[PDB]
């Protein structure tokens, strides 16, 4: 395959990372993941906007305009002949002799991007998945989509060890988000999800789902709920660029209602399906 | 010059880091810095022990014995002909297609180490430095010396822009540690420092300084203090492998006592001086 490296498209094996790349020594960088469906990038503008917002939050200046970044992604998808899967891309502050403080503005960011073929998780969407609650021990700027992902790594591993698809995180029993998703609960036909402050990532899929709820006249309340309240919900699901709307039918051996995917989850899945590129 | 790469000392130009090294994508790794004085490593055993401890805390298995690791560090120091400076070394979970959960145990960790010449910070040891308070927004496993350093990066940059040497961090108005140091206060000839729990890194220099206090019959209380209390200390200093015992004489324009280096800090600096390698 081919990898985007700065503004060049290069054979994968030509790409070399420096040991003093600040992404490698400090996790000093930001990233995005964009889903591609039948050759078309879904919500690419929103992801590019969020990459630049994440970068700006940690004062990294991306050296290309958004239009040029968009063009590069297009070229990367075409060169790799990606049909259905995702583009991963990240920006780090660059390479400089190791020191905590920022280097001279003479240092250029390092941009890496690549593709992976990866089907829609149709089985999960239909049947739902199991999850587990795990304490949120992450830093307090979860609104920045950074490469500092070690709390999420440990949470995901714990979930995978329990045979669960996702770890639902909580700060002293207040549900925040998933180790790599946003978390929604439904009760009495109302959609609940934690508000977008410094405690969660403002997911692109989260935002599409809220729009879907508005389109079908389902009330949305962006207020947090507890782990104990979550267990009493009528329906629960998680969202991400790759997981789409993935129903959660069981948490830690306790069924959500009857352990079946709920009616409102299905309605949202139906509205979501209208937004994604189809062949054709 | 020469870089430790996995189990070999190679020319720096031979080192190849993969874009999917989990140190680069998740900050999934741990590290150490060791001071070398006139060719001799200081407290190297304690730093190797801490490296293995940090690794174990995130379930990385280092693929060779502590004896082997010590051997490789000695060779690294000789090949580079390091006089006075430091060795940096890190271990990541390894290279694997991108996924939050751990890869299979077939994946070897990546070890990178290199040297830098860096003199003792003479001026700071003598004259003391300025510091600034910065709210501690880092994750809740600060006892692990991980590559997830973005909180510390932003804190140090804040200090540097205000012309300060160090950011002194505080969580719930309680002083924890510095962005890259531990913090000690002295009041009425007693030495105070935050206890070694999940809120701070248990510094090697910190432990040496506590040993030194014991040797000069100075009482030590590992009890945390607030920002308000810090400003009322008789003396204040920070410790790290490269800072040694750096007096702090002002925080945010407020002088610590008279803004002079205090008598107890000098006594501790003198005691510390007896521990460093001296081949005359
Ligand atoms: C902490 C946290 N919260 C929410 C999300 C969801 O964000 P969007 O992908 O919807 O923008 C994410 C992104 N997760 C994610 C993106 S692709 C993917 C995967 O499993 O492949 C996962 C996250 O890391
Ligand atoms: C958050 C945090 N707390 C305490 C320390 C001090 O630990 P020791 O270096 O004493 O083991 C450190 C390590 N600091 C440090 C080591 S080398 C260095 C430098 O300025 O070069 C700095 C740290 O990062």
| Distant-in-sequence, close-in-space partners of A197: CB < 8 Å, separation ≥ 6 | A143
| Distant-in-sequence, close-in-space partners of B270: CB < 8 Å, separation ≥ 6 | none
User: What is the domain extent for residue A170?
Assistant: 119-280
Long-range contacts of B68-73 (CB under 8 A, 24+ apart): B68/B7, B70/B44, B70/B45, B72/B4, B72/B7, B72/B9, B72/B113, B73/B4, B73/B34, B73/B41, B73/B44, B73/B48, B73/B113
Asked whether the beta carbons of A223 and A195 are under 8 A apart, the reply is yes
Please indicate whether residue B58, judged by its CB atom, sits closer than 6 Å to ligand 2: no
Q: Which residues of A63-87 are buried (b: 16+ CB within 10 A; e: fewer)?
A: eeeeeebeebbeebbeebebeebbb
Cβ distance B101 to A156 less than 8 Å, yes or no, reads yes
| Distant-in-sequence, close-in-space partners of B280: CB < 8 Å, separation ≥ 6 | none
Q: Indicate if B94 and B7 belong to the same structural domain.
A: yes
Please indicate whether residue A181, judged by its CB atom, sits closer than 6 Å to ligand 1: yes
A259-A265-A270 Cα angle (round to 5): 135
Asked whether the beta carbons of A28 and A91 are under 8 A apart, the reply is no
Structure token pair of residue A203? 């997911």
Q: Nearest by CB to A160, which of B101, B114, B139?
A: B101
Asked whether the beta carbons of B189 and B160 are under 8 A apart, the reply is no
Please tell me whether A64 is known to bind a ligand.
no
Residues of A annotated as catalytic are 145
Nearest to A248 by CA among A192, A165, A175, A169: A165
- The nearest CA of chain B is from the CA of A243 a distance in Å of 13
Among the bound ligands, the one closest to the CA of A124: 1
Q: Indicate if A103 and A126 belong to the same structural domain.
A: no
Nearest to B129 by CA among B183, B59, B170: B183
Nearest to B34 by CA among B111, B118, B94, B110: B118
Please indicate whether residue A204, judged by its CB atom, sits closer than 6 Å to ligand 1: yes
Asked whether the beta carbons of A188 and A234 are under 8 A apart, the reply is yes
Asked whether the beta carbons of A85 and A116 are under 8 A apart, the reply is yes
Asked whether the beta carbons of B138 and B125 are under 8 A apart, the reply is no
Q: Is B176 on the interface with A (CB under 8 A)?
A: no
B229: left (phi over 0), alpha (psi -120 to 50) or beta: alpha
B212: left (phi over 0), alpha (psi -120 to 50) or beta: alpha
Which of A69, A95, A118 finishes a domain? A118
Smallest CA–CA distance from A13 into chain B, residue: B18
Asked whether the beta carbons of A250 and A261 are under 8 A apart, the reply is no
Asked whether the beta carbons of A180 and A240 are under 8 A apart, the reply is yes
Structure token pair of residue A233? 């919900």
Q: Indicate if B128 and B114 belong to the same structural domain.
A: no
Q: Indicate if B242 and B126 belong to the same structural domain.
A: yes
Which residue minimizes the CA distance to atom 18 of ligand 1?
A242
Q: Indicate if B256 and B154 belong to the same structural domain.
A: yes
What CATH number is associated with residue A104? 3.30.470.10
Nearest to B73 by CA among B117, B32, B131, B107: B32
Which residue minimizes the CA distance to atom 16 of ligand 2?
B241
Structure token pair of residue A267? 């309605």
How far is residue A82's CA from residue B139's CA, in Å, rounded to a whole number? 37
Q: Indicate if A64 and A145 belong to the same structural domain.
A: no
Q: Indicate if A47 and A72 belong to the same structural domain.
A: yes
Smallest CA–CA distance from A110 into chain B, residue: B19
- The nearest CA of chain B is from the CA of A231 a distance in Å of 25
Q: How many separate domains does chain B show?
A: 2
Q: Indicate if A82 and A26 belong to the same structural domain.
A: yes
Q: Indicate if B158 and B78 belong to the same structural domain.
A: no
Which of B78, B95, B118 finishes a domain? B118
- The nearest CA of chain A is from the CA of B244 a distance in Å of 17
Q: Indicate if A69 and A174 belong to the same structural domain.
A: no
SS (H, E, C) chain A: CEEEECCEEEEHHHCCECCCEHHHHHCCEEEEEEEEECCEECCHHHHHHHHHHHHHHCCCCCCCCHHHHHHHHHHHHHHHCCCCEEEEEEEECCECCCCCCCCCCCCCCEEEEEEEECCCCHHHHHHCEEEEEEECCCCCCCCCCECCCHHHHHHHHHHHHCCCCEEEEEECCEEEEECCEEEEEEECCEEEECCCCCCCCCCHHHHHHHHHHHHCCCCEECCCCEHHHHCCCCEEEEEECCCEEEEEEEECCEECCCCCCCHHHHHHHHHHHCCCCCCC
SS (H, E, C) B111-169: EEEEEEECCCCHHHHHHCEEEEEEECCCCCCCCCCECCCHHHHHHHHHHHHCCCCEEEE
Q: Nearest by CB to A153, which of B17, B18, B28?
A: B28
Please indicate whether residue B125, judged by its CB atom, sits closer than 6 Å to ligand 2: no
What CATH number is associated with residue B133? 3.20.10.10
The answer for B 96-135 residues in CB contact with A (under 8 A) is: 97-98, 100-102, 112, 114, 116
Paired sense of beta strands B129-135 and B244-251, if any: parallel
Which of B85, B147, B161 is best to mutate for the A interface (most A CBs within 10 A)? B147
How many CB atoms sit inside 10 A of residue B67's CB? 9
Cβ distance A21 to B19 less than 8 Å, yes or no, reads no
The phi, psi pair for A99, rounded to 5°, reads -160, 150
> What order do you get walking across the sheet with B85-92 strand by strand?
B8-11, B2-5, B110-117, B85-92, B29-37, B40-41
Q: Indicate if A66 and A151 belong to the same structural domain.
A: no
Q: Indicate if A111 and A52 belong to the same structural domain.
A: yes
CA distances from A216 to A189, A204, A213 (A): 11, 19, 5
Smallest CA–CA distance from B135 into chain A, residue: A140
B44-B47-B50 Cα angle (round to 5): 150
Which of B102, B118, B134 finishes a domain? B118
């Amino acid at each position: 395959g081919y990898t985007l490296w700065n503004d060049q498209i290069v054979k994968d094996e030509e790409v070399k990372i420096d040991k003093e790349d600040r992404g490698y020594q400090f996790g000093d960088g930001v990233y995005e993941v964009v889903k591609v469906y039948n050759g078309e990038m879904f919500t690419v503008n929103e992801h590019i906007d969020r990459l630049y917002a994440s970068a700006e939050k940690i004062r990294i200046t991306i050296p290309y305009t958004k239009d040029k970044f968009h063009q590069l992604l297009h070229e990367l998808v075409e060169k790799n002949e990606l049909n259905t899967g995702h583009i991963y891309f990240q920006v780090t502050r660059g390479t400089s002799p190791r020191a905590h403080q920022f280097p001279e503005n003479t240092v250029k960011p390092v941009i890496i991007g690549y593709t992976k073929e990866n089907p829609r998780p149709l089985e999960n969407l239909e049947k739902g998945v199991k999850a587990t609650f795990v304490e949120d021990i992450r830093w307090l700027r979860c609104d920045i989509k950074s490469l500092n992902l070690l709390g999420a790594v440990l949470a995901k591993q714990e979930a995978h060890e329990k045979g669960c698809y996702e770890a639902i995180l909580h700060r002293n029993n207040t549900v925040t988000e998933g180790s790599s998703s946003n978390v929604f609960g439904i009760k009495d036909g109302i959609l609940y999800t934690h508000p977008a402050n410094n405690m969660i990532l403002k997911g692109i899929t989260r935002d599409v789902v809220i729009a879907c709820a508005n389109e079908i006249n389902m009330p949305v309340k962006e207020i947090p709920f507890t782990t104990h309240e979550a267990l009493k919900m009528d329906e629960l699901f998680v969202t991400s660029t790759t997981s789409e709307i993935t129903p959660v039918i069981e948490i830690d051996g306790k069924l959500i209602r009857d352990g079946k995917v709920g009616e409102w989850t299905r309605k949202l899945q139906k509205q979501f399906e209208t937004k994604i590129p189809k062949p054709l």
